[PDB]
């Protein structure tokens, strides 16, 4: 049971007690993403339209 | 300012429809002039969705009608409400379609349908955000049926992203006009199958047993049939029209009531439906909100499975009470709810109830029991097209025999698409 | 109307549980993956408990305790009746036991000399839960060489109290449910498992009273009792006529105060007191006695099955005490109190 | 001093963040439009309290908050709310129709034609931060723009603020108030994205908030106010380090050096107590032992779990009232006999414990009654993966029938990224049971 690391200040105090001791992606891939969703939905609403063309 | 544009289209489109505006612009507090005169803010808080203000604070319908005959638009236009519509808004030919799919898919209604477009258009660039649209038709006739999927066709070639709402009303030799009309709901059916994303599946056999049976009428009028719809309408479309959290717009419906693209036909049911002062408990209100004999489909859940489940409560109530008898409906009968999508059912309440009742209840299911309304449709169909029995009124419009037998095949696979998933 | 689901075939004390609430007309049963149940009778491993207590307006109650395996495995056991207070090394009434692969072999090896110096019997036995392979010997370097899972080695009671006449070895069953208040409820029906071969001091026939053993290895099955089970009636009178006590005073005073210690210690560590869901469980309790009239606490079942006899009148006290408690409908149990 | 950015999105994030400021505004003394008599130097300064608000000339501190919305509704009540005077209108960005649940339709659709709007308008708080600590995002695991915006902003954050800190205050689905069938999905997916890109998240299940509204504060039908209300509290417990004079987590670094010692595993539970009605005229208050003994009933934790069946990594007290080291340290050594409490065996068996003598602020009118003192329990538990447990299975049964997925394959997001975001929380799974096993 020790208390180690006080620090007190004026609104309050904080401590630490022991009990026991122990035994990304870059901005172009991103922007690569983004356009293949979107070139994915330009493909759907082409055969859609496609679709009703027919 | 997320805007719905209302298309009713045909005889039983324009009935339906006429009535459907003349219970909403009560509840809305619009009189039959426009002129808002209510006492609550909540009713002009989505107001937006439905109506287009114009100059004095008036509040116009963002609704087209459209007709091949003149006449049922005649008498909505000298309906009581009849003054609040867009005369603009009025497109109409003069020779109708006969009952008959083809005339109005193919002959008739190809003629009209530009118009028709003009005017969509003209809603929708005034519209901040149009979400999607509304249609309401019958399957059974010519022009609702025929040229009502024409026009859900071109409106989505022009509007792709937008969500595309029906109220189609589907034929009952109970109540029937003609003998084709198993054909023209037929056809229409695979347009919706392709075309909407979200169709409201009303049973004239339904909405007649429960005059019958139920309200104690022994002689029901297409009036005393229509009077179910507009009560089943006004409770659906309340969650757009007023404040909430829960289906709130078109599409967030669509996502929670939707899981595969083609399975979009739902069984709406309304509670109470009484032949009048007494209260009804929220018990009450949840065991007929649920019961068959409150369904507007004329199919047994039990028969099937509930892929999702929307409630909507109006009136005054314990809303704690709401949760209780809700979660007891689903926990005393989790077999007709598939277990593989888990919490199904969604609630939503709402304080404004409808006009004559202290509380209400509207029910809108997903369920795998609908595929009884198709195949009792195609069974008529294919009475009488295996004898090919009055098909010479199509092939006289252009038809081929073939397309009768696309149709037959496309509605027998959605059937088979409901069977697998209820097993 | 209440629902449950039932996860393990296998179990004939809740399919006659099952059965009963069936037959009550107030409970249904749903598939076994349905999750808007208010009872499960779930599966022995891996039951999911942290999806349990998380449907609204819905009371959940499950069949056994999570965490109750530390009292229910040889090894786990072993520890914590070294490692908790409550408990202590110094415990008396369970026999000094080891854990064989921390590991203690060299501790084991201590002791052991300490009893072949010593002149004292230094009879040991090794087993484990991966059983239906038990060792029994008086050599430790042939007991270590049959474990090379995690095996125990205790010490082997070599003075047991042999039931005449037959000269035969035994052991108690005890039947205790806890339900989801933490009370222990002690069935009043026990049954002694009894070995029907003499005890030979000098072949594992009459040393293992288990009761698949005895019916598949021993000629002598049936011959005294019907199925090598003595129920509590018989024992008791033998108690009288022979030794001229009683099973109360003599034995179940013990029983008791053991059933208690071992459930009171994990009390902080399984209780479903504040919890999102509640627990019950029955278990089954081991008991060996001595020639002295000293109990011994060899093992602790946290899925057992029950004498054939007593399968109606314990499965209805679990609808009663567990079940019903806490989905109320429309005493064979002995209350241990404690704090 | 160092400044931190709060970031705000979707409903949840929103109306839970408006809860937030409203809050510090009554901790600081800050008043509705702005003006703060205490603060001395007008203009300009380095206090703690500035780590979350800026100061113009006319003395007005200006929360460093950014509001996104893919719908108006839910930020115009912000525009026209109490502390309307706070933000101006480069802090409030808002959308014509929302991502309607779809994590797709709010990360790809939606989102790609908005990002660029949202990074330019955290660009403009951060220069004027002289040195930028990092951000706090809010936003739920539900909504489509809340689990679909927030992670592509999370990865442009890594891109364009590469050595600030993350912080993540996210809602986990409950059905009991949720809105949406496919939450599941958006959840999964919306973790498997932000998980390397965010060093700390503290999760709050609504099913816990709602039930310790229902319990503790007798609420029959909590609403997102009364939920609100509570989770600010939490988070103003979380926070308090960062705007107020101290040594315990005083940087956003420090969290996940006193928290966080496996970078995957970083979803410390909050535990907080006590939780009393206001409508009791005259309640006992509770004393440091009692509230620190109620730091381990689940039933006071921000997600129900059983840490008794999992092993603690780190453990941080945040005390705000009437309380001495010499109470908590007699609390903690009763609680020590009493409590399962397991470590892993490589980390000390310790509390790190913060005091703030300030005792806990309500807002005037509310559902909470005010106390001496009240403590915030961070606990990073193996324990809390029973709530991935939850959320992976009922994934699992919709996504075996392929159930709503034509959603989201409608936006442009390919198939395979359901079963790769998977196969993330089965290994997030698996690494919970290798630490706490
Ligand atoms: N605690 C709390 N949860 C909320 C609040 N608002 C919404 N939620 C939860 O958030 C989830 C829905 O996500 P939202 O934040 O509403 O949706 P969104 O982020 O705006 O994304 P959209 O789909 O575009 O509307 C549900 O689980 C709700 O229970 C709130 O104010 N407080
Ligand atoms: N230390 C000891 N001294 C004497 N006999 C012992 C003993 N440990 C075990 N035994 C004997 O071994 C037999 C079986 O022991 P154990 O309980 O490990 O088997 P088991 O667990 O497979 C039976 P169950 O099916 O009830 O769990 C007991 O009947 C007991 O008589
Ligand atoms: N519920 C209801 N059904 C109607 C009404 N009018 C016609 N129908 C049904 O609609 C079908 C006839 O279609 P109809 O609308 O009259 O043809 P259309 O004018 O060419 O579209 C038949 O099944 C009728 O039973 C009505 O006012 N209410
Ligand atoms: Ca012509
Ligand atoms: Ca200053
Ligand atoms: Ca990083
Ligand atoms: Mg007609
Ligand atoms: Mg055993
Ligand atoms: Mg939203």
């Known amino acids: 049971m020790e208390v180690i690391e006080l620090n007190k200040c004026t609104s309050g105090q904080s401590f630490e007690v022991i009990l026991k001791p122990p035994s990304d992606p870059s901005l172009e891939e991103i922007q690569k993403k983004l356009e293949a969703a979107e070139e994915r939905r330009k493909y759907q609403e082409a055969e859609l339209l496609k679709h009703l063309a027919e | 300012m997320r805007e719905i544009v209302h298309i009713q289209a045909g005889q039983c489109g324009n009935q339906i429809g006429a009535k459907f505006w003349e219970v909403i612009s009560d509840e809305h507090g619009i009189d039959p002039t426009g002129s808002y005169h209510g006492d609550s803010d909540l009713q002009l808080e989505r107001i937006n969705v439905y109506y287009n203000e114009a100059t004095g604070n008036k509040y116009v319908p963002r609704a087209i009608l459209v007709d091949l005959e003149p006449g049922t638009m005649d008498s909505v236009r000298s309906g009581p409400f009849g003054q609040i519509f867009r005369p603009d808004n009025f497109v109409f030919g003069q020779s109708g379609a006969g009952n008959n799919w083809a005339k109005g898919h193919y002959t008739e209604g190809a003629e009209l349908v530009d118009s028709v477009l003009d005017v969509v258009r003209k809603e929708s660039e005034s519209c901040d955000c149009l979400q999607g649209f509304q249609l309401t038709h019958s399957l059974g006739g010519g022009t609702g049926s025929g040229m009502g999927t024409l026009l859900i066709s071109k409106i989505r070639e022009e509007y792709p992203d937008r969500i595309m709402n029906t109220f189609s009303v589907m034929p009952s030799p109970k109540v029937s006009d003609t003998v084709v009309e198993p054909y023209n709901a037929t056809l229409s059916v695979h347009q919706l199958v392709e075309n909407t994303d979200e169709t409201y599946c009303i049973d004239n056999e339904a909405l007649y047993d429960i005059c019958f049976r139920t309200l104690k009428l022994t002689t029901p009028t297409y009036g005393d049939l229509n009077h179910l719809v507009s009560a089943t309408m006004s409770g659906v479309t309340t969650c757009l029209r007023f404040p909430g959290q829960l289906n709130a717009d078109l599409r967030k419906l669509a996502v929670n009531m939707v899981p595969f693209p083609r399975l979009h036909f739902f069984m709406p049911g309304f509670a109470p439906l009484t032949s009048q002062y007494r209260a009804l408990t929220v018990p009450e209100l949840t065991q007929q909100m649920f019961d068959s004999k409150n369904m507007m489909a004329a199919c047994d859940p039990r028969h099937g499975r509930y892929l999702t489940v929307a409630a909507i409560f109006r009136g005054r109530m314990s809303m704690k009470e709401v949760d209780e008898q809700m979660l007891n409906v689903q926990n005393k009968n989790s077999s007709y709810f598939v277990e593989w999508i888990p919490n199904n059912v969604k609630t939503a309440v709402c304080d404004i109830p409808p006009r004559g009742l202290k509380m209400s209840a509207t029910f809108i299911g997903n369920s795998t029991a609908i595929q009884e309304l198709f195949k009792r449709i195609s069974e008529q169909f294919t009475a009488m097209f295996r004898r090919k029995a009055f098909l010479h009124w199509y092939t006289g419009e252009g038809m081929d025999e073939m397309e009768f037998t696309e149709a037959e095949s496309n509605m027998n696979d959605l059937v088979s698409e409901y069977q697998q998933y209820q097993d | ?298 093992e602790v079942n946290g899925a057992p099955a029950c004498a054939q006899k007593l399968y109606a009148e314990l499965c209805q006290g679990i609808v009663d005490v567990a079940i019903s408690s806490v989905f109320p409908l429309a005493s064979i149990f002995i209350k241990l109190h404690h704090h | 001093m160092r400044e931190c950015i709060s970031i705000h999105v979707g409903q949840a994030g929103v109306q839970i963040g408006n809860a937030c400021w409203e809050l510090y505004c009554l901790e600081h003394g800050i008043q509705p439009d702005g003006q703060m008599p205490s603060d001395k130097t007008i203009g300009g300064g380095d206090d703690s309290f500035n780590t979350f608000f800026s100061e113009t000339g006319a003395g007005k501190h200006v929360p460093r908050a950014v509001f996104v919305d893919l719908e108006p509704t839910v930020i115009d009540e912000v525009r026209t709310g109490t502390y309307r005077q706070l933000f101006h209108p480069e802090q409030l960005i808002t959308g014509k129709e929302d991502a309607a649940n779809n994590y797709a339709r709010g990360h790809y659709t939606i989102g790609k034609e908005i990002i660029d709007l949202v990074l330019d308008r955290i660009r403009k708080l951060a220069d004027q931060c002289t040195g930028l600590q990092g951000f706090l995002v809010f936003h739920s695991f539900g909504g489509g723009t809340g689990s679909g915006f927030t992670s592509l902003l999370m990865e442009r954050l890594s891109v364009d603020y590469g050595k600030k800190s993350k912080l993540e205050f996210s809602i986990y689905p409950a059905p009991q108030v949720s809105t949406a069938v496919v939450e599941p999905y958006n959840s999964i997916l919306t973790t498997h994205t932000t998980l390397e890109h965010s060093d700390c998240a503290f999760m709050v299940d609504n099913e816990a908030i709602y039930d310790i509204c229902r319990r503790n504060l007798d609420i029959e039908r909590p609403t997102y106010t009364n939920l609100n209300r509570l989770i600010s509290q939490i988070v103003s417990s979380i926070t308090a380090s960062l705007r107020f004079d101290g040594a315990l987590n005083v940087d956003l670094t420090e969290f996940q050096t006193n928290l966080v010692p496996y970078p995957r595993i970083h979803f410390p539970l909050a535990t907080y107590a006590p939780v009393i009605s206001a409508e009791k005229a005259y309640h006992e208050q509770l004393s440091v032992a009692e509230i620190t003994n109620a730091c381990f009933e689940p039933a006071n934790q921000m997600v129900k779990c059983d840490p008794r069946h999992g092993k603690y990594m780190a453990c941080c007290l945040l005390y705000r009232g009437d309380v001495v080291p010499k109470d908590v340290n007699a609390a903690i050594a009763t609680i020590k006999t009493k409590r399962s409490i397991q470590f892993v065996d490589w980390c000390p068996t310790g509390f790190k414990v913060g005091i703030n003598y300030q005792p806990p602020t309500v807002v005037p009118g509310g559902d909470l009654a005010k106390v001496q003192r009240a403590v915030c329990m961070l606990s990073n538990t193996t324990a809390i993966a029973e709530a991935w447990a939850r959320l992976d299975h009922k994934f699992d049964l919709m996504y075996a029938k392929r159930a709503f997925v034509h959603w989201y394959v409608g936006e442009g997001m390919e198939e395979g990224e359901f079963s790769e975001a998977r196969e993330d929380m089965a290994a997030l799974e698996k690494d919970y049971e290798e630490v706490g096993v």
């Open chain 3, 1 to 298: 109307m209440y629902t449950f689901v039932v996860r393990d075939e296998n179990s004939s004390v809740y399919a006659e549980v099952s059965r009963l609430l069936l037959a009550t007309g107030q409970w249904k049963r749903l598939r076994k993956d349905n999750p808007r149940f208010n009872l499960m009778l779930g599966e022995r491993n891996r039951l999911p408990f942290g999806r349990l207590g998380h449907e609204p307006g819905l009371v959940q109650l499950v069949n056994y305790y999570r965490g109750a395996d530390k009292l229910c495995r040889k090894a786990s056991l072993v520890k914590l009746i070294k490692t908790s207070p409550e408990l202590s090394e110094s415990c008396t009434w369970f026999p000094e036991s080891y854990v064989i692969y921390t590991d203690e072999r060299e501790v084991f090896l201590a002791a052991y000399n300490r009893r072949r110096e010593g002149r004292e019997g230094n009879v040991w036995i090794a087993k484990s839960s991966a059983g239906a392979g038990i060792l029994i010997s008086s050599e430790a370097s042939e007991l270590l060489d049959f474990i090379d899972q995690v095996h125990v080695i205790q010490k082997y009671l070599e003075k047991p109290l042999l039931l005449e006449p037959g000269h035969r070895k035994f052991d108690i069953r005890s039947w205790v449910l806890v339900d989801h208040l933490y009370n222990i409820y002690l069935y009043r029906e026990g049954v002694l498992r009894t070995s029907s071969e003499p005890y030979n001091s000098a072949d594992k026939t009459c040393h293992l009273t288990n009761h698949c053993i005895q019916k598949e290895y021993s000629k002598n099955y049936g011959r005294y009792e019907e199925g090598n089970e003595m129920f509590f009636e018989e024992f008791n009178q033998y108690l009288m006529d022979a030794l001229n006590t009683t099973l109360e005073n003599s034995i179940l005073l013990q029983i008791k105060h053991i059933i208690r210690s071992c459930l009171m210690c994990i009390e902080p560590a399984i209780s479903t007191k504040h919890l999102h869901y509640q627990s019950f469980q029955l278990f089954g309790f081991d008991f060996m006695v001595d020639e002295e009239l000293k109990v011994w606490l060899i």
